[PDB]
Amino acid sequence: SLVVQEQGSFQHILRLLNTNVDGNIKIVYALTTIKGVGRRYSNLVCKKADVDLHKRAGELTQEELERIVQIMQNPTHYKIPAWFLNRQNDITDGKDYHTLANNVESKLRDDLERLKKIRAHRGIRHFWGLRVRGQHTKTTGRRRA
Amino acid sequence: IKIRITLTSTKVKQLENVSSNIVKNAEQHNLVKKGPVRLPTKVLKISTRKTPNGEGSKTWETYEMRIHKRYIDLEAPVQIVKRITQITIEPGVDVEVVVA
Amino acid sequence: AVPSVQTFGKKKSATAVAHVKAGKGLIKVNGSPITLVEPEILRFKVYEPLLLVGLDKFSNIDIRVRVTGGGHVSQVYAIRQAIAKGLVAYHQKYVDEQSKNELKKAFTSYDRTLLIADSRRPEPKKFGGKGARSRFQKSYR
Amino acid sequence: VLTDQNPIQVVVDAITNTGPREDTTRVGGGGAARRQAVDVSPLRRVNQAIALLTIGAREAAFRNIKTIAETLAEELINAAKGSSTSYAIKKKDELERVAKSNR
Amino acid sequence: KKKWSKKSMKDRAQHAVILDQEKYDRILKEVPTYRYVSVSVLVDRLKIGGSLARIALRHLEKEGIIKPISKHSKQAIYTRAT
Amino acid sequence: GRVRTKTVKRASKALIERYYPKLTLDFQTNKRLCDEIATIQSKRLRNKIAGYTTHLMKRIQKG
Amino acid sequence: PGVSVRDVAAQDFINAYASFLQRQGKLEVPGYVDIVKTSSGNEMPPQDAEGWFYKRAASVARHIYMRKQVGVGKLNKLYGGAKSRGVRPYKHIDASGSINRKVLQALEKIGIVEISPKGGRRISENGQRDLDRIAAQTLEEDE
Amino acid sequence: LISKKRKLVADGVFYAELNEFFTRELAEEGYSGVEVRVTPTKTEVIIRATRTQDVLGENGRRINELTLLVQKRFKYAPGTIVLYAERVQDRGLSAVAQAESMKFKLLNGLAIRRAAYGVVRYVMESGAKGCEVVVSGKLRAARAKAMKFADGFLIHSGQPVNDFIDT
Amino acid sequence: ENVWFSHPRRYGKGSRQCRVCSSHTGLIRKYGLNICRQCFREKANDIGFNKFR
RNA sequence: UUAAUUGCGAUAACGAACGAGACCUUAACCUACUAAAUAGUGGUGCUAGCAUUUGCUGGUUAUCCACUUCUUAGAGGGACUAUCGGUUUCAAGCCGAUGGAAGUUUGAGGCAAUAACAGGUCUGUGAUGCCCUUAGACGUUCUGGGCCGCACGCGCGCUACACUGACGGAGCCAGCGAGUCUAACCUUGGCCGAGAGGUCUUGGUAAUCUUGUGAAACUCCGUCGUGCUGGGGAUAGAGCAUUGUAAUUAUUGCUCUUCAACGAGGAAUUCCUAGUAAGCGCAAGUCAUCAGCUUGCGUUGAUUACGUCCCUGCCCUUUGUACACAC
């Protein structure tokens, strides 16, 4: 039944991994707004950082923030099972990353351009803006604009 | 020895009469037995569209082949068991014998 | 030979076989007391026969119900029918026929379905629709 | 918990206060279909009342922090007392107004 | 094309997820004289979040001014004790 | 509805015509005697015949 | 005449037994907990991270008591649920085979369950004694 | 070692196979139906026919050919299946035989109406309660017509058609 | 020729066919009769399948 | 009057036949017969726990006996509107009430006149007449593609727009049905794995094993909090596995990530009268792999009617017609 004083320490808005994150909400579901991390990853990162999940995002310490972002940046160093990551065995180097807000867009654009340059069918479909996973384009996907 | 005759027919009348004559024959032969255990009827159902083509209202029909299975356990010498098998045969009713 | 009777309670698919004996006044279903069927509402629904007839009528009766089939609501209704009909059968076997008559008269006055199994059997589905009567959809243009 | 009188009594009072007594039926007229005021039905009074209370509770519980149970309780309290701020009583008086108008 | 609406302002409530002392004293002194108390009642009478209302209900029941009636989840009913 | 058809009506009429003294105003005994006094290809049909025969006996017994 | 988890309610007893098991903490938790979702059908892991394994253990022990013998496939089927397959209709999906199997192994090591003939795991005598003791404790404390 | 369901279905398909084989080979021999009895190490197939001697053949040559054909086609041990030709009772009261006779007459070139009326009269005088013959197709025309020749009375609905009617 | 039928026919419509008319469509595997539906609707009575409902 | 050329009757008609009905399956009832180590019941032989007062809760086929209440099936019985009240050329019937398992011909089907349609099908058939091709063939087969392509319009649908909820944990429930032979199906259990899946054999050709198909919706506690939000999960990236000779214009599953419209829907229009609609899932079909589809099955189980001919049609009679390829 603790009561926190709405000081500058309890900030409703914070900057994290080069993007804005709201307070006033659960810590894990505020981490989820980081592009490239979902509910599973946010929950696991909070649990490994030992910050209480039920705590709100507004009330955290600087060490809590920095430790969280360190865990996001370097998952495998903190006993991540290495199948939680969204870049498994990369085409570039072969090890496992989990991306952040900017690098998810960076790597998506990089692999789209890779497919487009090697002229694969998937890349050519991506270039045309058509469906790539073999759907039926006859009837659906009309709102392409 | 506890032999067992299982009857696996489809025609319930012929199956019933063969079972009745077999049990009465064992009754007259003074054989220890249990009654004819009647397992639940097994229906083999096929649902098929009536039309050979695809035209018309989507009507179906279900053909059901009913299999009636009975079994009676007897204890008798092999000569009388063979005589039992070789008497009271009704076509369409198929009979097999096992032990235990 | 201990006095004992065997009855059942039925529903759409729920069968509750009840063994009723002269005991110390207890009710149990699948080894669990009648207070732990745990819908917290159908629990009072199965309390209904005992409460309606009075607990004095279960002074020296032990009831064991074994329940199979049908969802939770059907199972509870089968249980209540089974225990009511078991008490009625016990009173018909050993207790005064007048007492049995007033017992079942009170039962039927409160609810017909404590002694009489329901007759609402499911209607088979027919082709051309997802259910017994519902058809698919008629489209012209 | 509110209005500590009998819950069954306040429920039935809401039902009888909400039963719409004057209604309307469609009549051909000729050329343009019009509407005819018709009185009479206690079974329909009861049915329409129950449906009106339940529908208003559903609407006030839809997309709201208020739970369906409490919104139904509030609607029943409002109808039983008579307030014209409940959905069911509001629709009742609207129906009677239009029936009196087309009368 | 069109969004099937008018694109106007909504109610746009500002329920508070965290309270301060100016809320703590207010809730503690005002939760009496309440004929009916619920999580929704707390939310719409205090402009606070549902989790905060549930925490307030649990803490208030722990201390004891309101008595409970039903313990069922998804619907909590409380009445003041006079 | 319950409108019995020509087969049952005519057979009951014939049964009444040629068996008035032996059969009575009670459905149960009427049916239990009809089963043995006239062969019916159906138990339900025989029950229908017996019911209408009982109705006809009741009609005859007054006027 | 006698106490039993049969005569004790379900949720409260499983919670009490889970609390007891967690308070002791001799169950050899595998260590890959706080990762899995307990199924391929669940979309999230359990909400109480530091526990939920004692809750699964209590549920499994009581389930084994109530039945005679169950196995890993039975537990997968039991703890499975409807999975939201996107725009496809829901469907039953099993639970985590590894989680159920390892809770069985832990209960085996502590002796609550034992490998029974004809496959599966049955209740053991010490498991019977223990669970009946928790039922007796529950009814002596609450009443 | 097969399941009971598959055993019964295989027996049915077997019966359909021999029925089709006999109805296609023994057509001119008045073949009308068969029945199969099961005896340990002996399956006896009874061929009901009107030209029993012709289906038997000369000195049993044709019955031996039929038995050997069935044996080797259904992969039985030689001598397991025995074929017995039986003269069908009441040739008139057999719709299959009568349809075969009508088909034979039409193949000869007898008039459609005359052949149908002869079939109807024979069936009725053979003790039938009713006969109906439908001839459908191009009958000295270019547009198909369907003529019906009936006597007595038949039925269409219920179980009485499902047994008493031979089609 | 070793290529005239080299392609496998171990599953699907290439292997499965009707046992009275060699049709790859409308087959009925249920209970192993391998009869297409069109011919089964003709031969069901003498096979043993009859209509009751 | 009936659901009915169903009957009562009237009567230039009498006597019949088909269709309806009857009939045949399926679902309801049987503490009545036959019963049953492939189904369930009771003191115990033996052994478990609180508990030994004199109980409660479990396990064991060759360790005993007796029973079919429940399960199964065979033979039947039962209901024919039974009995009363009201009404009717005081008939056929109908309407109420009491019993009864069942009282809208008990519910649902199967079967189903005459006469037709130039409706569908020659791409089911070695079922076929005529026409066409028939050897670089329109035969057949092999390798690749296509049937899935996408500006757009339409139909059957699946998922939703939410806290009568989503998520997590806990409980316990069905019924229909299928399953391996000159070839490998349904697969328990132990072990590995987060998961999808992978390894060993006894299990089952089957009321004996999958399989009490421990299904799901659903109930008990929690987290979320009216924010396109922990609603929705489309569209995409990376990886693992499985089936297949082969998956790339992703088979499918799984893990992480991406987190779009959609804030209940205009004109219009579909289905439906009780275990029915609707919700929910399961099993079988085609199935090497693929269900968002069908055929059934069971679970939870509303509203509203007990009418009418207003719209759309149908049956009968009368009537008018310049219609008969028939408005």
Curated annotation (Swiss-Prot), chain C:
The modification Phosphoserine is found at residues 32, 59, 74. One of its GO terms (biological process) is translational initiation. The modification Phosphothreonine is found at residue 68. Residues 121-141 are annotated as: Disordered. Pfam families: Ribosomal_S9. The keyword Cell cycle does not apply. Residues 132-141 have a biased composition (Basic residues). InterPro entries: Ribosomal_Su5_D2-typ_SF, Ribosomal_uS9, Ribosomal_uS9_CS, Ribsml_uS5_D2-typ_fold_subgr. There is a cross-link at residues 28, 45, 57 (Glycyl lysine isopeptide (Lys-Gly) (interchain with G-Cter in ubiquitin)). It is found in: Cytoplasm. Keywords: Acetylation, Cytoplasm, Isopeptide bond, Phosphoprotein, Ribonucleoprotein, Ribosomal protein, Ubl conjugation. GO terms for molecular function: RNA binding; structural constituent of ribosome. The keyword 4Fe-4S does not apply. It comes from the Eukaryota. PROSITE patterns: RIBOSOMAL_S9. One of its GO terms (cellular component) is 90S preribosome. Signal peptide: none annotated. Present with 33800 molecules/cell in log phase SD medium. There are 2 genes for uS9 in yeast. Belongs to the universal ribosomal protein uS9 family. Component of the small ribosomal subunit (SSU). Mature yeast ribosomes consist of a small (40S) and a large (60S) subunit. The 40S small subunit contains 1 molecule of ribosomal RNA (18S rRNA) and 33 different proteins (encoded by 57 genes). The large 60S subunit contains 3 rRNA molecules (25S, 5.8S and 5S rRNA) and 46 different proteins (encoded by 81 genes). This is Small ribosomal subunit protein uS9A.
Swiss-Prot record, chain D:
N-terminally acetylated by acetyltransferase NatA. It is found in: Cytoplasm. There is a cross-link at residue 81 (Glycyl lysine isopeptide (Lys-Gly) (interchain with G-Cter in ubiquitin)). Transmembrane segments: none annotated. Component of the ribosome, a large ribonucleoprotein complex responsible for the synthesis of proteins in the cell. The small ribosomal subunit (SSU) binds messenger RNAs (mRNAs) and translates the encoded message by selecting cognate aminoacyl-transfer RNA (tRNA) molecules. The large subunit (LSU) contains the ribosomal catalytic site termed the peptidyl transferase center (PTC), which catalyzes the formation of peptide bonds, thereby polymerizing the amino acids delivered by tRNAs into a polypeptide chain. Component of the small ribosomal subunit (SSU). Mature yeast ribosomes consist of a small (40S) and a large (60S) subunit. The 40S small subunit contains 1 molecule of ribosomal RNA (18S rRNA) and 33 different proteins (encoded by 57 genes). The large 60S subunit contains 3 rRNA molecules (25S, 5.8S and 5S rRNA) and 46 different proteins (encoded by 81 genes). Belongs to the universal ribosomal protein uS7 family. This is Small ribosomal subunit protein uS7.
Curated annotation (Swiss-Prot), chain E:
One of its GO terms (biological process) is cytoplasmic translation. GO terms for molecular function: structural constituent of ribosome. Residues 1-7 have a biased composition (Basic residues). GO terms for cellular component: cytosol; cytosolic small ribosomal subunit. The keyword Ribonucleoprotein applies. It is found in: Cytoplasm. Keywords: Cytoplasm, Methylation, Ribonucleoprotein, Ribosomal protein. Component of the ribosome, a large ribonucleoprotein complex responsible for the synthesis of proteins in the cell. The small ribosomal subunit (SSU) binds messenger RNAs (mRNAs) and translates the encoded message by selecting cognate aminoacyl-transfer RNA (tRNA) molecules. The large subunit (LSU) contains the ribosomal catalytic site termed the peptidyl transferase center (PTC), which catalyzes the formation of peptide bonds, thereby polymerizing the amino acids delivered by tRNAs into a polypeptide chain. Belongs to the eukaryotic ribosomal protein eS25 family. Component of the small ribosomal subunit (SSU). Mature yeast ribosomes consist of a small (40S) and a large (60S) subunit. The 40S small subunit contains 1 molecule of ribosomal RNA (18S rRNA) and 33 different proteins (encoded by 57 genes). The large 60S subunit contains 3 rRNA molecules (25S, 5.8S and 5S rRNA) and 46 different proteins (encoded by 81 genes). It is presumed that the precursor part of S25 is engaged in assembling of the small subunit, thus being essential in ribosome maturation. The gene is RPS25A.
From Swiss-Prot, chain G:
Disruption phenotype: Disruption of a single RPS19 gene reduces cell growth; a double disruption is lethal. Depletion experiments show the proteins are required for correct maturation of precursor rRNA to generate the 18S small rRNA. A specific site between the 18S and 5.8S precursors (site A2 in ETS1) is not cleaved in disruption mutants. Partially assembled ribosomes are retained in the nucleolus rather than being exported to the cytoplasm. All effects are exacerbated in the double disruption. Increases association of NOC4 with 20S/21S pre-rRNA, decreases association of ENP1, TSR1 and RIO2 with 20S/21S pre-rRNA. Its main location: cytoplasm. GO terms for cellular component: cytosol; cytosolic small ribosomal subunit. One of its GO terms (molecular function) is RNA binding. Keywords: Cytoplasm, Ribonucleoprotein, Ribosomal protein, Ribosome biogenesis. SMART domains: Ribosomal_S19e. InterPro entries: Ribosomal_eS19, Ribosomal_eS19_CS, WH-like_DNA-bd_sf, WH_DNA-bd_sf. GO terms for biological process: ribosomal small subunit assembly; ribosomal small subunit biogenesis; ribosomal subunit export from nucleus; translation. It is found in: Cytoplasm. This is Small ribosomal subunit protein eS19A. It comes from Saccharomyces cerevisiae (strain ATCC 204508 / S288c) (Baker's yeast). The gene is RPS19A.
